[PDB]
Design a protein around this ligand. Structure first.
Ligand SMILES: Nc1ncnc2c1ncn2[C@@H]1O[C@H](COP(=O)(O)OP(=O)(O)O)[C@@H](O)[C@H]1O
Ligand SMILES: Nc1ncnc2c1ncn2[C@@H]1O[C@H](COP(=O)(O)OP(=O)(O)O)[C@@H](O)[C@H]1O
Lengths: 302, 303
């Protein structure tokens, strides 16, 4: 068993990905080589990759896509890339064509969890509560059924880029133009205030298992929630996970306001440093970091 | 401008991909090259690709993916692959990484439109009428909130393979078993009877224009126009669905008409393209000649 870890990426989460890679490389219980996608889209192999890792950021790459990589030398690929060209299903589509088993959600799941509008339409139809929202498409004026404040976001970007809180309708047009700077589609959802952010990890292929619930405020593991609400969080996370057909893992984020839960999004490739929420959550669930990585690889083969 | 046409594929529609590719080449108003993906997954380039088109099939190829192809000499890529590794977003995803403009639906819309279960969830949520249904995954006992008869089918496949009609609830298990032979997930929906199958094509990015409506008819063929009394309603539903799903380039949308009630069945992101295929013909009757259709499709990939 030899594993290929791909880190970096052209997205803003480029340095975070390399951090996660540092953590995975030191604990994965399998011979593993690193491949880095520089911020310019080019790749770095072997030594140059490890050198880039130490630098904690690789602005320039050597080989343009597709790289002269010896794919036959690996049994499983672990795409530890965040955001665009990472969790959207493109790298996965590539790996599919290479006939390479890999860690994480497949093309459909990735592309779908990544779209804030489509995933919401699917989850709402299945009975999973989501914040009231409306989709706005580049070129056609907005129609918002509820009143401000809103939160405007690009539908398929990530890393909070292009996101803004709108207090009045008069500021809506400018918020959409900002979001459209990154996407052809945007979402306008009700701004919850005050609100609490809860996060829960899921592991498995389609029918997964939830880890304990966490809260972002500093990460509070576990979250100070009453018995019933904690159960619903895990329950809703497993339901949405199954409906979307996610494979491998996912960190599901929820908002809690007025005692009500709303599933915000499913992150198919969450931060993976030994101190990130997903790993810490499962550590709390009795699954050590090395074992977590072992399971992901095992899941990729089934 | 230089276009790159990719045809064949590892799916069971390999032969038909080549046929529509033959038609495309005969009329595409741009210098165009052909690249073929054999049934064994290896790519055939240059004259070998055209030689392959000749035989109407390419069992084996020369270059294993990724092919040593000069993508830089092409402005637009036209993927004419069907089903798996065709319209499921995989090829699309690869093209997105090569930073190459391409015809048709993007990664998400393609993956989404190929999943009967997922696209029906989105459409129903959006108000678009669909046949009642439930998803059944391999591993969980089937629970159907309605009585038979009903059709059982693989959620993600090609040429209606693995589809069956169930009259007795005691025949559901065998139907699901058949369906699970092509996918890990299946759809169980209310069987419409009698039913008429309509189809309308769509061109454009997100906000498209509908073609006239045609009606399918199998002999013991498509009727353009369709003997409807409704065509408007079908076109509105098609464009609405097209928009919500965020489809780009094109799509043939199939509907079921029963008891005066319309039901959108599915959106095909990569319809057959022979001069006589349902998509090209529908648009022809809509004033969009075959060469024009191709021209626009290629230009749309750039906008
Ligand atoms: N509907 C909302 N109501 C209140 N706050 C929100 C809402 N949506 C987003 N936010 C705020 O913006 C932040 C980022 O939203 P998010 O969708 O998670 O962006 P990203 O997908 O990049 O992580 C959240 O942590 C939250 O504080
Ligand atoms: N709900 C239904 N009611 C009646 N007939 C159906 C129904 N679903 C499918 N069929 C029949 O089965 C055939 C194949 O189903 P379909 O979804 O169109 O497969 P495909 O995606 O290959 O076109 C249809 O052409 C239709 O005649």
């Amino acid at each position: 068993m030899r594993v290929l870890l791909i880190a970096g990426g052209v997205s803003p989460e480029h340095e975070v990905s390399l951090l996660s890679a540092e953590g995975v490389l030191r604990h994965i219980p399998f011979p593993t080589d690193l491949a880095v996608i520089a911020q310019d889209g080019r790749w770095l192999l072997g030594e140059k990759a490890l050198t880039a890792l130490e630098a904690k950021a690789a602005p320039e790459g050597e080989h343009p896509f597709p790289p002269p990589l010896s794919w036959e030398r690996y049994d499983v690929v672990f795409p530890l890339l965040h955001g665009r060209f990472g969790e959207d299903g493109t790298v996965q589509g590539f790996l599919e064509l290479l006939g390479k088993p890999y860690v994480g959600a497949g093309v459909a799941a990735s592309a779908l969890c990544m779209d804030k509008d489509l995933s919401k339409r699917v989850l709402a139809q299945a009975g999973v509560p989501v914040v009231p929202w409306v989709a706005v498409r580049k070129g056609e004026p907005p129609v918002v059924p509820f009143d401000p404040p809103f939160f405007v976001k690009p539908a398929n970007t990530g890393s909070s880029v292009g996101i803004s809180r709108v207090e009045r309708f008069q500021d809506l047009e400018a918020a959409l133009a900002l979001a459209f700077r990154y996407d052809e589609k945007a979402v306008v959802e009700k701004a919850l205030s005050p609100v609490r952010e809860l996060e829960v990890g899921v592991l498995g292929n389609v029918f997964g298992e939830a880890s304990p619930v966490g809260e972002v405020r500093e990460l509070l593991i576990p979250a100070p929630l009453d018995p019933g609400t904690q159960e619903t969080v895990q329950e809703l996370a497993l339901k949405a996970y199954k409906v979307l057909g996610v494979r491998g893992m996912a960190r599901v984020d929820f908002f809690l306001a007025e005692g009500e839960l709303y599933l915000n999004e499913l992150n198919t490739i969450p931060g993976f440093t030994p101190t990130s929420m997903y790993p810490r959550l499962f550590e709390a669930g009795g699954v050590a970091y090395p074992e977590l990585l072992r399971r992901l690889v095992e899941l990729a083969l089934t």
